[PDB]
Structure formats: structure tokens, C-alpha cells
């Protein structure tokens, strides 16, 4: 049944993947081949051109992603070739690399090889390949929290952090056939760093923050027609909320609200002045400014909820129905002053697409 | 048939609700009377201990409400009694005057005759029974949008508006029989009005607004143990994000967010300037300011989420199944700064509860 379930899926890839690449006349032979290449060897392997769009119809199908108008856009690195920890180390290094690209962020992904019959060939042990580490014991709470158990792991195989909030994790990934992953320390030279001023408020620079320039999801699986990449990071641009509403504003992540209160001249007593709401608005607007000033990509929540209206469009133009996570779309600062508030989305999951998987170190 | 869906609906209300109130040995013998009851009239009437009860019922029941801490000590007015159209518009009239209670306002809901056989007694137009009219001709646009339908009814039946912005719309509802509705003037001195101030910007006065002290819902349907109460209308107190986030907010309300952001002297010219997030800010800090300084009862969203999940926390204490919805239950202001964000809820309908129902006028 497990050469049957291949099957399936590569006959509605190829077809859909095909016709929107002209070449719909292609599409019987190439899965004769297919059909040919399952029964021999259990698998198939895309060509350069179906894992390239493939990636891009995953990306497009991501309900929960605000950012998809751009999903034609991706750059797709194929590194399907790697077979020992330095290559898998260099491409880690490379993606980091191209990716940021001075700032100007390029839309990435690198894919790995495959799973062979669920035998992973890499396993990417990083939520993110670029994320601060946490520590707690004590009653002492460093760095990011949700990195707690991540940071625990890299420091049971050698790896020691020097405790300040802003550790960066190195990256950590086990090959086929070893017992225990290797880890290495990311060069500080690829790794963009923006500090966290306001434009308005000197004493902001007090709180002493800071946060990377590219986040590189790097745990989640890729699956195109059957296939399983589950090494495949990818990135975009931070939209400004995700950091100043969620990553450094959220009790259990780094709970600076009160803090930023303070340097800004407002009290943190009373739930009817609003403090943290207001908090919330100056450490947001300090995250864009401190990005734009540095020239590092990033996207308001108002510009990306007008890039995903002219998604929607494109959506129906082309005659594609349009799937999408309210829950998720929704910005956390203002949701009603965006148009996805005051709409309704289909939460139908589509193939390709990107998925969750169990993390190996908890 | 249809005298076989009350009897199921009563079945299960009765028993429950004897339950809660500790009558539980008085349940069979109800039910012998309800079924001869509805065996020989087609239906059957309330105590006033279940209409009570039931009515509280309804309001633990809904979903979409944030405020259900204060279930039980919801005000019940029994007004099935009523037969005329001056005893619709004098308890709609001591519906105002007591639950408004000079500011401190009452939890209350004034109960009126239920459907016979899907015959209405008395149907109420107002969607509240404060509201401001609305006004779209020319290209003015003037008063409340949402109100622009039921403000042409209005006309049409010899009511004239004054065309400010603050037009109080008349109570209209129709009896059974008559053709068209009757509409009778609010008096002014039963409606508390609060204006919206600023604390700290003094220039915040410019705008002129100002909103009504007591939203009374009245064009909803309470349905208790298969009994159609179409015209109940009830009222809380405001959250202060429903005055400030969407009704002078949205665009398609009174739109005010570029009028408060010139007011409190930030521009609205960029979205990386976040001024319209500032602006909700102010905004709703003034309406909470202002209900607070007039004494008008008002709950922020904070206190309002952290009341909630003292809900949440009774309900599992009693043993009670929890049901939300979670896209409304979230405010519209720092979502993710409130515990409900950060959790699911199951959007199941129990009954007892209040429903939609379609309007007479369109
Ligand atoms: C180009 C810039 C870009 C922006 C801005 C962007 N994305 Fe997404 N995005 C996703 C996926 C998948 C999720 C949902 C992940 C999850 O469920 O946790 C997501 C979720 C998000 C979220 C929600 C995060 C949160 O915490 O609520 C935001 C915001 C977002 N994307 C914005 C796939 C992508 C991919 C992959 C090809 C790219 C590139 C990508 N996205 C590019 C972008
Ligand atoms: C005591 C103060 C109180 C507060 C504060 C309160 N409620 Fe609700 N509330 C509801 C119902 C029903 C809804 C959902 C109506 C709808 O679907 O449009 C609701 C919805 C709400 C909403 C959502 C409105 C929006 O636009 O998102 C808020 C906020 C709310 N309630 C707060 C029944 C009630 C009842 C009836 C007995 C009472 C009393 C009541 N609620 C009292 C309160
Ligand atoms: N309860 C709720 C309700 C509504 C919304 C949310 C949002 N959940 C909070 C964030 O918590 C997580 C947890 C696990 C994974 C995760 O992935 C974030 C992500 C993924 C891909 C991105 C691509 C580009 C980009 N710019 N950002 C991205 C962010 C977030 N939670
Ligand atoms: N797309 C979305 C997504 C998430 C949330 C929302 C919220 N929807 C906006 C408001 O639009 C309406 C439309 C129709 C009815 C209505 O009832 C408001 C109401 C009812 C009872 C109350 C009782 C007490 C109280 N204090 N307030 C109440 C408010 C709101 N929309
Ligand atoms: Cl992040
Ligand atoms: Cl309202």
C-alpha cells in the first residue's frame, strides 16, 4: 500500500504542477516513467523543475502565511546531492548567507534529500538555524525561553552557552546512521543583527534589545506529490509584529511590555490606561524603524494585509480557490484595522504544502 | 411533528435546569403537566423560576460572549403579560431607565410574549434600543451607516431625523395584526450619553464624539426549552474596544481613526509609522476615560479577559462544559496580551441560548 499512496499523490502533482507550467502535453509520459521508476526502486525523484514549483505551490498553500503573494518569487536551492555533515553544514551556512543577502532578504528555501521509507537522510534539530538560546534553572530566566529544551540538548553534546540573553544556538543536525547529532557554531560574520531604538524615545536604547535579521523555519516538512522532504529550511522577511508582539512582548518568551513601559514614561498600574496596549504600539514601531534603519527587509502588518488583499485577487483572477487560517492571518496588533478581520477563510489543507513533525529532543 | 420537537426541548431544559436549582425531585411531575399541556394547547408557559433561570442559561451559553462571569446575577423582567402597544414601549421605556440605574448599569433583560406557532406577538425593528441613525444620499455620508437601513424604514413611517451625526433612532416594533409599526420617540432624559475625552490631550474635545451609555441588544432570540422568545431585548455594559476598535473606528462606521490621529499630532501618512494602531490606542483610552469620569459603567478588555478566565475557571469547577468562540472572544485590541488568545475553545451550541433571526426591514 505504500508504493500505492506514491502513486496517488504523483498523479495529481505532476498534473496540477504541469498545467501551470505549459507543459500539459508532458504530463502522460512523465508518469509513465514515474509509475516505471515506483515499482523499481519504491520512489521517484522530481525533476529540478517540479521540486522548484513544487516548492512554490507549498508555499502558496500555507493558510496560515499573510506573505504568499510572492510565492513566485522563492528561491529554490536544490542540495539534494549533500551526502556528509560538511555539506549539509556549508548549505546550512550558504542559505544563511544568500538569504540575507546584505539585508535585502531573498525568499529561500535549500532542500535536502528526502525520506528514503521514512528513514530520514538529515535530521535538522533547529527550530530555527539562526535563534537565541534559553536557560533556566534557578529561578533564573536568560535568554528565549522557548529555546529551553533545544539549549539543553546542544548542552548535553559539548556545546556551552555563555548565558547572556542573546546566545546564538549553533546548529545542530544528525545524519543517517548516527546515534547523536554533530553541532556547529554559526559564524558571527553571516549572522545580521538589528538592535531595537526608537525614533522618538532616546531611552529605548536602555532596554538593551536586539533581534536576528532572517527568520529560517527549519523543522518543518516539505511534502511535494508524495515525496517527504523533511530537511528543507526556508525563509522570508520578519513582518514587525511577529517580534515586538509575540517574541519580545509575550510572558512566557522574552515579557519586556513593562519594561518598555517604563523608558517610555507611562505606568504599568492600571488595566484602563491601556499601558500595555500602548507598550505594545512604541515597541512595534521601534522594531520597524530599528529594521529600516539598519536595512534589513521587514514588512508592517498594515503593508502585508494589503499584499495579501492583492493575493486574494490574484487567487480568483486565475481561477484558483483560495485557502487560508483566520486564526493565523489576523495580525496580533489592530486585527480589525486589516480587511482579513472582516472576512471568512477556508482552512482546507492543499498539497504541496508544509508540515509539522515531531522534534527529536524534548 | 412540531408538537413533538417542544416536548424534546422541554425534556431536556426542565431537567436541567431543576437540576441546577436543586428541584430536581420536581422534574418528573412538571413534565406530566407540560405534556398534557402542550397536548391540549400546543404548547406551554414558564414559571417565572424557569424563565429566569433560563434566561441565565442562555447568556452562559453564548459563545461569543467575553462577560458570562455575570451569568447569575443576570436582571429577568417578565413582561408576557403585555397586550398593547403602550405596554411595549412603557417597558421598553423602564427597560432603559433600569438598567441604565444613573450609570451604574444593571444587567437586564425585559421579556416580552413568546411566538404562538411561529406568530410573533410583538416584533421589535431596533437593532438596540439606543441607537444613532444613519444617512447615505448625496455622497454625505452622516450618522451610523449600520443604521442607514432601518433609518429609511423609519422615514418611510412619518419619523424625520434632525441629520446630526447623533440622531437618537425611535423605538418601532410592530404588534400582531397590525400591518406596519409604530414608532414613539426616545425621551431624552431616560438616555445617558457620555462625550469622549481624553485624559491627558485636551485637544481630543475638536472631534465632538460621543456615544450612548447602554448598548441594549433587542433584536435577538432566546430560545428556552423550545419556547421562542423572539422579542427579549437585553443589556450589559460596554467593553470599551465595541465604542472605540470598531464603532468610531471602522471605515465603514464612523471612520474617525485619521481624525484622532491628527487630534493627538502624529501623521497618517506611512503604515511603518503604525498611526493607526496609535490612534486606536488614544481612542480607546478616551473611551474609557470618559465612561469612567461620567460614571457609566464599562469594563476594559484586559480586566474583561481576566474575568473571563475566572468564567473558564468556575466552569470546570462546577463540572460545566466550556463552549466559545474563540474569533470573537478575542478582542480587537493586544489580542495576544489576553490569555484567550493563547488557548482553543469548542464553538458547540447549547441551548438554552440567544440566535439571529432575520429582520423585518431590508
Ligand atoms: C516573504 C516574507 C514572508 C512573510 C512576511 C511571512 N511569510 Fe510565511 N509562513 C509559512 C508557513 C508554512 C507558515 C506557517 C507555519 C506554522 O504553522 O507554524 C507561515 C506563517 C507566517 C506567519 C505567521 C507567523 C506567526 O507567528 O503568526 C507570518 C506572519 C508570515 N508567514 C509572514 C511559509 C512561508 C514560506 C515558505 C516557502 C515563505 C518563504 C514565507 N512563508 C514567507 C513569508
Ligand atoms: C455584563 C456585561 C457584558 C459584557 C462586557 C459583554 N457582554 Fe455579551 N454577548 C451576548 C451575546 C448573545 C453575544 C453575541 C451576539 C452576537 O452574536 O452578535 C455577546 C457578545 C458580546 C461581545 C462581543 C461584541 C463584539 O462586537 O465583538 C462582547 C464584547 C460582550 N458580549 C461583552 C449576550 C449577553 C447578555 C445576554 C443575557 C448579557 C447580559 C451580556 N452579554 C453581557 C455582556
Ligand atoms: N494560538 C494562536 C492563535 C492565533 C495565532 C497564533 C500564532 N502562533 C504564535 C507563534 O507561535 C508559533 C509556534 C510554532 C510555530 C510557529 O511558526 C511561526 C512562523 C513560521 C513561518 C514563517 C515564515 C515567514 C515569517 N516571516 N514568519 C514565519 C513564522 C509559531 N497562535
Ligand atoms: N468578522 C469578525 C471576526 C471576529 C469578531 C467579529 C465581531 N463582530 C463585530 C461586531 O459586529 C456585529 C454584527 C452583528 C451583531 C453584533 O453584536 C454585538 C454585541 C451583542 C451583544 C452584546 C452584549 C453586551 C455587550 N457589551 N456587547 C454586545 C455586543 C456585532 N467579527
Ligand atoms: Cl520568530
Ligand atoms: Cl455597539
Not at 529605548?204 to 517527504?228: A, N, R
Not at 488583499?309 to 483560495?322: D, S, T
Amino acid at each position: 500500500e505504500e508504493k500505492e499512496i506514491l502513486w496517488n499523490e504523483a498523479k495529481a502533482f505532476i498534473a496540477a504542477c504541469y498545467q501551470e507550467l505549459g507543459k500539459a502535453a508532458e504530463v502522460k509520459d512523465r508518469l509513465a516513467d514515474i509509475k516505471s521508476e515506483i515499482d523499481l526502486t519504491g520512489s521517484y525523484v522530481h525533476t529540478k523543475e517540479e521540486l522548484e514549483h513544487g516548492a512554490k505551490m507549498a508555499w502558496r498553500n500555507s493558510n496560515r502565511c499573510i506573505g504568499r503573494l510572492f510565492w513566485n518569487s522563492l528561491n529554490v536551492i536544490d542540495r539534494r546531492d549533500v551526502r556528509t555533515k560538511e555539506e549539509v553544514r556549508d548549505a546550512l551556512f550558504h542559505h544563511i548567507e544568500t538569504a540575507t543577502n546584505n539585508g535585502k532578504i531573498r525568499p529561500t528555501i535549500t532542500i535536502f534529500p528526502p525520506e528514503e521509507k521514512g528513514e530520514k537522510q538529515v535530521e535538522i534539530w533547529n527550530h530555527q538555524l539562526i535563534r537565541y538560546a534559553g536557560y533556566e534553572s534557578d529561578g533564573e530566566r536568560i535568554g528565549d525561553p522557548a529555546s529551553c529544551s533545544l539549549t539543553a540538548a546542544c548542552e548535553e553534546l559539548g556545546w556551552r552557552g555563555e548565558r547572556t540573553d542573546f546566545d546564538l544556538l549553533p546548529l545542530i543536525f544528525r545524519m543517517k546512521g548516527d546515534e547523536q547529532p554533530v553541532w556547529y557554531e554559526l559564524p558571527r560574520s553571516l549572522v545580521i543583527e538589528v538592535p531595537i531604538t526608537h525614533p522618538d524615545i532616546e531611552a529605548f536604547s536602555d532596554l538593551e534589545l536586539k533581534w536576528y535579521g532572517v527568520p529560517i523555519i527549519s523543522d518543518m516538512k516539505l511534502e511535494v506529490g508524495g515525496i517527504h522532504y523533511n530537511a528543507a529550511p526556508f525563509n522570508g522577511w520578519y513582518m514587525g509584529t511577529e517580534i515586538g508582539a509575540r517574541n519580545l512582548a509575550d510572558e512566557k518568551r522574552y515579557d519586556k511590555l513593562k519594561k518598555v513601559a517604563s523608558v517610555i514614561g507611562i505606568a504599568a498600574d492600571y488595566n484602563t490606561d491601556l499601558w500595555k496596549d500602548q507598550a505594545l504600539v512604541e515597541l512595534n514601531k521601534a522594531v520597524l524603524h530599528s529594521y529600516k534603519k539598519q536595512g534589513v527587509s521587514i514588512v508592517d502588518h498594515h503593508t502585508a494585509a494589503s499584499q495579501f488583499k492583492r493575493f486574494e485577487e490574484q487567487a480568483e483572477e486565475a481561477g484558483r480557490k483560495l485557502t487560508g487560517d483566520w486564526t493565523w492571518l489576523i495580525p496580533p496588533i489592530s486585527p480589525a484595522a486589516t480587511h482579513i478581520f472582516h472576512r471568512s477563510y477556508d482552512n482546507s489543507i492543499v498539497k504541496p504544502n508544509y508540515f509539522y513533525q515531531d522534534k527529536p529532543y524534548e
